[PDB]
Design a protein around this motif. Structure first.
Motif, short mmCIF file in Angstrom:
data_model
loop_
_atom_site.label_atom_id
_atom_site.label_comp_id
_atom_site.label_asym_id
_atom_site.label_seq_id
_atom_site.Cartn_x
_atom_site.Cartn_y
_atom_site.Cartn_z
N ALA A 155 31.93 -20.58 -18.82
CA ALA A 155 32.80 -20.70 -17.60
C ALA A 155 32.60 -19.92 -16.42
O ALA A 155 33.10 -20.28 -15.33
CB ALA A 155 34.50 -20.60 -18.08
N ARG A 156 31.92 -19.03 -16.52
CA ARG A 156 31.53 -18.16 -15.51
C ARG A 156 30.63 -18.70 -14.40
O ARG A 156 31.02 -18.92 -13.08
CB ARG A 156 30.78 -16.95 -15.90
N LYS A 157 29.70 -19.61 -14.71
CA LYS A 157 28.59 -20.21 -13.79
C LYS A 157 29.13 -21.42 -13.24
O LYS A 157 28.47 -22.02 -12.29
CB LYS A 157 27.50 -20.52 -14.43
N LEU A 158 30.61 -21.87 -13.39
CA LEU A 158 31.06 -23.22 -13.13
C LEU A 158 31.57 -23.19 -11.48
O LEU A 158 31.14 -24.28 -10.95
CB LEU A 158 32.01 -23.63 -13.86
N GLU A 159 32.22 -22.19 -11.22
CA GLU A 159 32.81 -22.14 -9.82
C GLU A 159 31.65 -21.85 -8.60
O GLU A 159 30.81 -21.12 -9.20
CB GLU A 159 33.90 -20.96 -9.77
N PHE A 160 32.13 -22.14 -7.62
CA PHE A 160 31.41 -22.15 -6.43
C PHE A 160 30.99 -20.58 -6.10
O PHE A 160 31.74 -19.49 -6.50
CB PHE A 160 32.06 -22.85 -5.18
N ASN A 161 30.09 -20.36 -5.12
CA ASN A 161 30.05 -19.30 -4.27
C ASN A 161 31.20 -19.27 -3.53
O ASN A 161 31.68 -20.45 -2.87
CB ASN A 161 28.48 -19.04 -3.71
N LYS A 162 31.55 -17.86 -2.85
CA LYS A 162 32.52 -17.88 -2.03
C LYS A 162 31.97 -18.50 -0.59
O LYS A 162 32.77 -18.93 0.28
CB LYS A 162 32.55 -16.07 -1.49
N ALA A 163 30.71 -18.44 -0.42
CA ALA A 163 30.08 -19.06 0.87
C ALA A 163 30.11 -20.56 0.61
O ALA A 163 30.34 -21.27 1.57
CB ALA A 163 28.55 -18.65 1.24
N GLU A 164 29.73 -21.11 -0.51
CA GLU A 164 29.75 -22.50 -0.80
C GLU A 164 31.17 -22.98 -0.70
O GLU A 164 31.22 -24.64 -0.28
CB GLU A 164 29.22 -22.78 -2.34
N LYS A 165 32.01 -22.47 -0.71
CA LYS A 165 33.58 -23.07 -0.63
C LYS A 165 33.76 -23.43 0.74
O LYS A 165 34.33 -24.47 0.96
CB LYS A 165 34.48 -22.08 -1.45
N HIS A 166 33.50 -22.63 1.77
CA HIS A 166 33.67 -22.93 2.92
C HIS A 166 32.97 -24.29 3.39
O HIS A 166 33.40 -24.90 4.21
CB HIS A 166 33.33 -21.82 3.83
N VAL A 167 31.75 -24.39 2.91
CA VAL A 167 30.75 -25.42 3.29
C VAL A 167 31.36 -26.68 2.85
O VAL A 167 31.55 -27.78 3.50
CB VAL A 167 29.41 -25.23 2.68
N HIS A 168 31.73 -26.71 1.33
CA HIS A 168 32.37 -27.81 0.93
C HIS A 168 33.62 -28.32 1.35
O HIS A 168 33.98 -29.49 1.64
CB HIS A 168 32.57 -27.70 -0.59
N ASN A 169 34.47 -27.42 1.78
CA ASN A 169 35.73 -27.75 2.64
C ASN A 169 35.54 -28.32 3.79
O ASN A 169 36.10 -29.12 4.39
CB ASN A 169 36.70 -26.28 2.57
N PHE A 170 34.56 -27.56 4.56
CA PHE A 170 34.05 -28.24 5.88
C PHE A 170 33.74 -29.55 5.80
O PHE A 170 33.93 -30.33 6.83
CB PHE A 170 33.01 -27.31 6.55
N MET A 171 32.77 -29.78 4.94
CA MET A 171 32.63 -31.16 4.65
C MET A 171 33.37 -32.18 4.35
O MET A 171 33.55 -33.40 4.85
CB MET A 171 31.10 -31.13 3.85
N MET A 172 34.33 -31.77 3.48
CA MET A 172 35.46 -32.59 3.10
C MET A 172 36.47 -32.71 4.27
O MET A 172 36.96 -33.77 4.39
CB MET A 172 36.21 -32.01 1.86
N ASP A 173 36.60 -31.80 5.26
CA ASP A 173 37.14 -32.08 6.46
C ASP A 173 36.89 -33.32 7.30
O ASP A 173 37.36 -34.19 7.87
CB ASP A 173 37.27 -30.75 7.30
N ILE A 174 35.25 -33.25 7.59
CA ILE A 174 34.86 -34.14 8.46
C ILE A 174 34.66 -35.50 7.78
O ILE A 174 34.57 -36.46 8.24
CB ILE A 174 33.36 -33.83 8.99
#
Ligand SMILES: [Ca+2]
Ligand SMILES: [Ca+2]
Ligand SMILES: [Ca+2]
Ligand SMILES: [Ca+2]
Ligand SMILES: [Ca+2]
Ligand SMILES: [Ca+2]
Ligand SMILES: [Ca+2]
Ligand SMILES: [Ca+2]
Ligand SMILES: [Ca+2]
Ligand SMILES: [Ca+2]
Ligand SMILES: [Ca+2]
Ligand SMILES: [Ca+2]
Lengths: 146, 360, 360, 360, 360, 146, 146, 146
Positions: E260-279
């Motif tokens: 279960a540990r390796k599944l969630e994003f990095n803290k940095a990756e979360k911003h990137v994914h969210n910014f991509m989903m924004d546009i």
């Protein structure tokens, strides 16, 4: 007094947990320090109000004989005093220090089961033994202890 | 610029050749599954079809042999392009060519044709050797997804230094479709694994190890039930009956969190529910406190009447009302403490507004 | 306004017709369960009762057929009302009417009457076809709950844009009664599922697949034990013995978190426990430090006496007291570090008070 | 004050009578377990001992009958004392006396004496009826713990309005000794439950349901293994073989979190480990960057020498060093980002210090 | 200083003697495993080899007997050095010497030599008595790791008062290599445990309890499957078949979190994914809103044309476009609310920057 | 009006949840208090803007007859008014309060499926019934309700 | 240029994601806005430094032809330019903008495998093609690209 | 000194981890920087107090020969010096820098097991070898090392 010496001693350290400085008494700032240490933030006004809840001599400072009377209400399970008092506090919607008959009609007639106002008038008439036209807190306490 | 348009051309070529490779691998799997069906249900009088199927599988894996070469040669050409090489012997790295030749061997695996109606020894495991080529699937998952190709992604990722890789695309498809991935895994296992176990064990006289036994055996080992109505006899069946329970523990352990995620409220919903419970409990305190006075004045009425049994009945219900009122008041205070704790980060940002207003 | 009082009238009609529909569905389930009891325990000499029961089930599902029509027609009328339509052909949307006709077919399922004392083939599965109508239950859960009807909810939800739906009411009943929902699920499964498996498999001569076998089989598959004393023989029994273990994993995995939630302290209780452990460990440090001096002066006493064996006995206990004192001091320091970390958000809000006092 | 010293006297009486009651309940359990041993291993020629044991159990539960009366009468006397009653009929509340008379019935349960060497029917379940008195244990856990008696606790709890109850003492003993509670539960189950199942099923001729079968059966049902070597035959054995697996799921699900808690670092340890990894990776970056220059100058040396095969060997290792250096730099940057995120609440409290210095 | 260089000398001696001890313990395990192989597969005509192997194991454990003495004597000498003792009788503490003599007894365990081709009774358990010496492994894990030796660690740990112990080194190797530790545990269990069970049960005539049965039995008990094809017969086999399932629950429960540990994003990756989903969603709102106008003007066109059936077809698709647009807008608003909640601690540190700019 | 007395009463407490003081109306600060209590922080400008969304008389304060018209849009499921309005808000990329033909060509020609500009010219010609050369919001609302 | 029109178009929106205002260029504040939106907080000096990393004309503002050269390094996997540059940044322990022979002896002699100083002297002699007595960054870049 | 050269070298980098600037010594601000980097926030007074714990020359700055004596206490397991010192700190309830006989009677008579005051008087008499009438810290340290 009637308390045995071992029990006197074990209440003494509990009192010492309030008088952290050993001032011979309990002050406002000491009590607020305890309140902050237990994870709640009152005001000076709230602390002073709880002093006025408990201050029998009227000093603003608390000693051990007041503290015994204090814990006498708290050592038992159900503080029936406090339960009547805060229920009264629910009733005073205006903060008047009173229960008016209008507040009484707002509460008991519609909410509850249909008590008639003439019976409520007889209730208010037997209730105002002070004759204040309304219910005090002293009238309320004597009323519930009638 | 010249190595960049060339880069995109070669990458599109690589995606197309990953498409053809996935198609030809699935076709080889389809050949092996129906060959395994037709050898059992056909008997020993349809040998011409089995001969032609074995030649078909041989050419079918010859094509995949050419395709993996064509893939990794372009990958090497990319790697030379990125650094401006010309000597192709240099870029052919040791671990790199080791992985390539290892993949040549692993996809060199096939049921090779050997020849009173039953099997030989090695040609069953060589038939099993096909499904060891399932590693090409995440490669096509990578390349057919255009997120590597789309440039704005690469721009932002280079800004935040995040390195688009397989772990990125996996978490992408995982947290964009959390249900579909888990469903497509478990529903892909639950029957196909049992077909493989039916290949692994066969009895000729009694017919006691074919599809209708393993299709019941493997979901039971998967769900860690273990009746014992069917039990693997060979050692190679025992290995599969370990791997099955392993994958079952895996799918159970991934399913439990997928269940648990959707249960809690939204952050917005929590305020709404709490505010509704506030105005509910306020009216309920008015209810209980009304019951208090209602019983209190009746007890006082029978007190003034000196009705003995009525007072004895009433004062019990009085104390019961007190006991109910105390618990209601405690629930209201606990919820109000939750409110003052639900305005922790809320009041933080409110005083972030007031701190801009303190900077103003 | 005129479409709004009409809206509430139609919604109350819909709630009442959801009540009648739930009653008539439970009645059809009660008909099928007792019909399945009386065919086995009655034999072949009570056929008149079975005939009348089959006619009863036919009329009983005819009524549900009328009721689903009456429900969804009012739902369509609501949808026309919300947008001011008049042409009822327009609002009859494709996916909408598809779901409606699909529900017509799914609740068109019933053990239809066909006719030396035993069953036919299809009429057992057609008897099984009743419990595929259990999807109407959350519909009645939705409509009989008045939270959709109560207006203040809708006002606040429209303010915070939260969209009252089935997922809302589910989380509502889940986090208002966390125990009762889980109990009502598991206790509804644990016996009824086994009754269904007894329908699924029947042996005529030996009587080895009826209630007293499946009522033991299905809790064992549910709890993933799998003895092997009873094993399903048909394939349709094998399907149910997969679904059973699935639901068992589900109920286990939901029960574990329900256990884990109630274990930790309240936020208020944590301060109280920590403050009590503070004054305990303070006195305990006074205890251990007293043991230190008590042994120290005794060792120094026997030192001045030059008592050799007494000093040899004492200095060991001295070092033991030192070792105990170090661990006690470390526990006190760890707990005090917890205190200074338990005044993280506490001191945050305290300096939020002091930050209003910095704004003052 | 007079009702307060009296309160403490009565509470001490209640603790002592809870001690005597726990002793006499454990004695009745010890009587029933050895009676169940001696009836099987003694045969039918030691009936005098069984007669005297049945009279012993009858007097032994007569004493517990007197003790529960003595307990709850004092509890009622406390409740009258707290409110100043005199009429004892009033305080005897309906749910209260209902619980009392229910407890009278539940502890009215005993193997009553009835009378070619084997049992009757009811007297086995009546022997089973003893272990339904195990609810008195948390009562003695409550009263023998002096936290209700110690006044300073009650003072602070009344200040923070936290209501010392059974849920408080449970979490107290749970989070003061997390290992011991779980160990004392599982090790209390693992053998005693199987002894109870041996009571539940007995075969006379074959001796196939006694201790040596259930002591293997119940840990296997507990651990959800389910071999099938021993299987319960009666229905009452089937009930216990459900409850066993229930408790096994419970103990497994509580054990998993107890394992998981002790694994993560202390808050202080995390800074130390991160600071050590910092100075490790700094030196390692110096290592990799040295390998870069070391290979770079060798490749440039063989370049100036125009050594063809040496350059072809070297430049591969050059690019390999570059690839290693990139990954090392990325790990260092990720850890430094963790550092700047590990100084989130740390820098928060640092600027809480600087915010007192902003208030100064 | 003189006791400090001496301290490091003695500690290096202790590490070397921990190395020799681990080697000689693994050698004794290798002796016992091959002795157990050669007694079964050799028969009763190779007794000379068994005699020489028993003498080898006796000398082999005599050496470990000398080595544990040499270890703990140096540990005592360290403890005297740290406090400046001279009388070695004093430092020999009671619990300390108790642990030492207990370890002498536990490593005093060996298959001692006793003497138509089969075993005696005690010498099988005495052969089992070797693998009770596996506690020396974390001792060598401690001492061969130089983190106790490296001084800078000790400096920082003394600054933060963290006390380097076994719990520290365990978490060190755990959170520096999370995969390798779990793999080295499970892969060390999965076969060796079954070899031990083969020692525990042996049948002479039928050969039904040797390696090829327990090597299938113990992974099945480990994975909580429990077929029932092989079942332990003796009681000592029943104990091992409990411990096996215990360790299986342990390894499963540790593996689930590692997954279960390796599944969630990095803290940095979360911003990137969210910014991509924004546009992405911005363009998608432009898409849906374009579909709205596109259908709206067509419906209005056929309205001006008064085309009845075209309007009846169009207005349905109009409302469908509205329904799609609403859900798209809600997803965009939910994600934007996530953004304004993803700038919670981000805006906190931004206004920490602005609060230094408020201090400026 | 057409509403029944029980329904009038149940909307009255919902209105009372806005008029927490019983001022006889709804003010800006009362509404912002509710907004903060539900976990969102608007500005005074945002509150005033949502007032301008809802204020029919033009007072800045809201009464019960306005509140009924307010909840009339909210009690139903799909606020088709709001869905057209915010889709219009998407269109006004410049914030002009209008849709120009350049914004129209930016949206519909390339994105969507290839609607010809002369047909878009006929659309804009039938669209500008106000003759503004462009689309208002009133023109847009009347246009979608045409 | 050599880029095809579809690829030109798809880089244009990526450029548009930087020029959020459509100013025709990229400014410092726009870039810092993006940096904050992605969860990292540089200074104006750090932003200006990364401009100086990328600014070819020397304007402080970035246009699309500079942006193509920018993404040309970033579109590939391993920025071998950046890897040499930051490794050089590791070497300049004093921040001089140079590698001295003392820094070289600090790095390569002890750490690594025992390269002799006379060979290191020949390395520094062939290295200082600028004759600076030490290594520049331009000397370092030309040196690694020698 | 007696330390071998490899051990001298490995303590040198540990010393270098304190002298992060290479000033030749250890200062207060450098140490507080380390304290903050490890997640604890002392005051300047607390830092200065821990300097006064360790400063042998009396400079306020620490060098390597002081650092060896420093780590000599820390490299071992049980700092028996520190354990006696902080136990003494527990005893000084008034912060006097002394243990009075009243503090001694407060501790040892009631808490512990009933040591007689005349024996405690003989203890204090043999204890005050300085003759201070009470226990110093130097008297306490010499006393425990007697
Ligand atoms: Ca005081
Ligand atoms: Ca006073
Ligand atoms: Ca009033
Ligand atoms: Ca108002
Ligand atoms: Ca208005
Ligand atoms: Ca516009
Ligand atoms: Ca711009
Ligand atoms: Ca520029
Ligand atoms: Ca330099
Ligand atoms: Ca320095
Ligand atoms: Ca100094
Ligand atoms: Ca003192």
């Amino acid at each position: 007094d009637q308390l045995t010496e071992e029990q006197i001693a074990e209440f003494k350290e509990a009192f010492s947990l309030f008088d952290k400085d050993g001032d011979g008494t309990i002050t406002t700032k000491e009590l607020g320090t305890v309140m902050r240490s237990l994870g709640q933030n009152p005001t000076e006004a709230e602390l002073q109000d709880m002093i006025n809840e408990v201050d029998a001599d009227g000093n603003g400072t608390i000693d051990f004989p007041e503290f015994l009377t204090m814990m006498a209400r708290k050592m038992k399970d159900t503080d029936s005093e406090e339960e009547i008092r805060e229920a009264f506090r629910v009733f005073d919607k205006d903060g008047n220090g009173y229960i008016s008959a209008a507040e009484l009609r707002h509460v008991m007639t519609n909410l509850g089961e249909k008590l008639t106002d003439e019976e409520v008038d007889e209730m208010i008439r037997e209730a105002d033994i002070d004759g204040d036209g309304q219910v005090n807190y002293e009238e309320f306490v004597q009323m519930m202890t009638a | 610029l010249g190595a960049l348009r060339r880069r995109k051309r070669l990458l599109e070529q690589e995606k197309s050749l990953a498409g053809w490779a996935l198609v030809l691998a699935g076709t080889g799997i389809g050949l092996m599954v129906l060959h395994a069906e037709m050898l059992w249900f056909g008997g020993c009088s349809w040998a011409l079809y089995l001969f032609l199927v074995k030649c078909t599988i041989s050419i079918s894996t010859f094509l995949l042999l050419c395709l993996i070469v064509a893939f990794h040669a372009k990958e090497v050409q990319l790697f030379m392009t990125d650094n401006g090489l010309r000597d192709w012997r240099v870029a052919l790295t040791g671990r790199q060519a080791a992985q390539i030749v290892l993949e040549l061997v692993v996809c060199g695996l096939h049921p090779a044709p050997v020849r009173p109606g039953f099997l030989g020894q090695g040609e069953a495991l060589l038939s099993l050797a096909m499904l060891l080529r399932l590693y090409l699937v995440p490669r096509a998952v990578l390349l057919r997804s255009g997120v590597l190709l789309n440039a704005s992604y690469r721009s932002i990722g280079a800004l935040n230094q995040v390195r688009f890789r397989h772990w990125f695309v996996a978490k992408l498809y995982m947290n964009t479709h959390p249900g579909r991935l888990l469903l497509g895994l478990t529903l892909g296992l639950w029957l196909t694994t049992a077909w493989v176990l039916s290949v692994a064990e066969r009895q000729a006289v009694n017919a006691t190890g074919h599809l209708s036994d393993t299709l019941w055996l493997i979901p039971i080992t998967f769900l860690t039930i273990g009746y014992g109505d069917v039990v693997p006899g060979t050692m190679w069946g025992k290995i599969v009956c370990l791997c099955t329970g392993v994958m079952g523990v895996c799918c159970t352990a991934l399913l439990v969190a997928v269940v648990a995620r959707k249960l809690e409220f939204n952050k917005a919903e929590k305020h709404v529910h709490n505010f509704m419970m506030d105005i509910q409990y306020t009216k309920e305190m008015k209810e209980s406190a009304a019951r208090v006075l209602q019983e209190a004045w009746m007890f006082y009425k029978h007190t003034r009447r000196k009705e003995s049994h009525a007072a004895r009945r009433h004062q019990r219900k009085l104390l019961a009302a007190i006991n109910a009122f105390r618990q209601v008041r405690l629930k209201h205070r606990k919820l109000r403490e939750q409110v003052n704790s639900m305005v922790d980060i809320s009041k933080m940002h409110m005083i972030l507004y007031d701190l801009q207003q303190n900077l103003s």
